[PDB]
Amino acid sequence: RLYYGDDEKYFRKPYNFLKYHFEALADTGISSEFYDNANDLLSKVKKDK
Amino acid sequence: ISTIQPKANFDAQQFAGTWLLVAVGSACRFLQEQGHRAEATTLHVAPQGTAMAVSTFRKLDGICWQVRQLYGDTGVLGRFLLQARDARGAVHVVVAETDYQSFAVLYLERAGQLSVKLYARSLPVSDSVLSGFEQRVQEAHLTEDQIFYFPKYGFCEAADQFHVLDEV
């Protein structure tokens, strides 16, 4: 039999806690930003007499 | 221990490699009540020297689950203790009868509990081995109502990293 052991089903709340809620949540927020610029400007004159 | 003895000159080496669980005769009502929904159980075995690495695999709800147990050497060739992992207690396992290239019969005993398993290298098992095991069940004083056959398909080698129970 492959089965789940029923131990640890409950914990006793110490008196100093008004609540201990045990709600399970996850939040994942991800932001990825990429910015690239190039500004290339060759300018030239050549001359002869 | 019951009136049972190991395979004479049991060899962990040849007993090594994969075994398929064919059938289990047990007093454990878990197989009696909801004996259906017991998955095809495969048992990779490796000589941990005197102990044996024994990785059961199952499809728990279709989740491939490896359960690596040391069948730790009790100090008698072919008898094992399985650590006594927890309140599960010590489980006295005896390789009672086998030919290492086709079949083996294992006896597993716990306090007030005895269970016997038929394993085969390949499936189907020979009818001679089947009826021999059924005789072993009679000699264990179990009834036919207490023999439960495990399905022949959906064996699941290679439980992942996380679906590995690693009881040790």
UniProtKB/Swiss-Prot annotation, chain A:
Protein origin, superkingdom: Eukaryota
Protein's cellular compartments: Secreted; Target cell membrane
Disease entry from the Swiss-Prot or TrEMBL record: Complement component 8 deficiency, 1: A rare defect of the complement classical pathway associated with susceptibility to severe recurrent infections, predominantly by Neisseria gonorrhoeae or Neisseria meningitidis.
Its biological purpose: Component of the membrane attack complex (MAC), a multiprotein complex activated by the complement cascade, which inserts into a target cell membrane and forms a pore, leading to target cell membrane rupture and cell lysis. The MAC is initiated by proteolytic cleavage of C5 into complement C5b in response to the classical, alternative, lectin and GZMK complement pathways. The complement pathways consist in a cascade of proteins that leads to phagocytosis and breakdown of pathogens and signaling that strengthens the adaptive immune system.
Family in the record: Belongs to the complement C6/C7/C8/C9 family.
Assembly and interaction partners: Heterotrimer of 3 chains: alpha (C8A), beta (C8B) and gamma (C8G); the alpha and gamma chains are disulfide bonded. Component of the membrane attack complex (MAC), composed of complement C5b, C6, C7, C8A, C8B, C8G and multiple copies of the pore-forming subunit C9.
Protein name: Complement component C8 alpha chain
From Swiss-Prot, chain B:
CC terms in the record's Gene Ontology section: blood microparticle; extracellular exosome; extracellular region; membrane attack complex; plasma membrane
Domain of life of the native organism: Eukaryota
Native species: Homo sapiens
Activity control note: Membrane attack complex (MAC) assembly is inhibited by CD59, thereby protecting self-cells from damage during complement activation. MAC assembly is also inhibited by clusterin (CLU) chaperones that inhibit polymerization of C9.
Biological processes, Gene Ontology terms: complement activation, alternative pathway; complement activation, classical pathway; killing of cells of another organism; positive regulation of immune response
Protein function: Component of the membrane attack complex (MAC), a multiprotein complex activated by the complement cascade, which inserts into a target cell membrane and forms a pore, leading to target cell membrane rupture and cell lysis. The MAC is initiated by proteolytic cleavage of C5 into complement C5b in response to the classical, alternative, lectin and GZMK complement pathways. The complement pathways consist in a cascade of proteins that leads to phagocytosis and breakdown of pathogens and signaling that strengthens the adaptive immune system.
Shown stretch of the complete protein: 33 to 200 of 202
Lineage start: Eukaryota, Metazoa, Chordata, Craniata, Vertebrata
GO molecular function: retinol binding
Quaternary state and interactors: Heterotrimer of 3 chains: alpha (C8A), beta (C8B) and gamma (C8G); the alpha and gamma chains are disulfide bonded. Component of the membrane attack complex (MAC), composed of complement C5b, C6, C7, C8A, C8B, C8G and multiple copies of the pore-forming subunit C9.
Keywords: Complement alternate pathway, Complement pathway, Cytolysis, Disulfide bond, Immunity, Innate immunity, Membrane, Membrane attack complex, Pyrrolidone carboxylic acid, Retinol-binding, Secreted, Signal, Target cell membrane, Target membrane
Protein name: Complement component C8 gamma chain
Primary localization: secreted
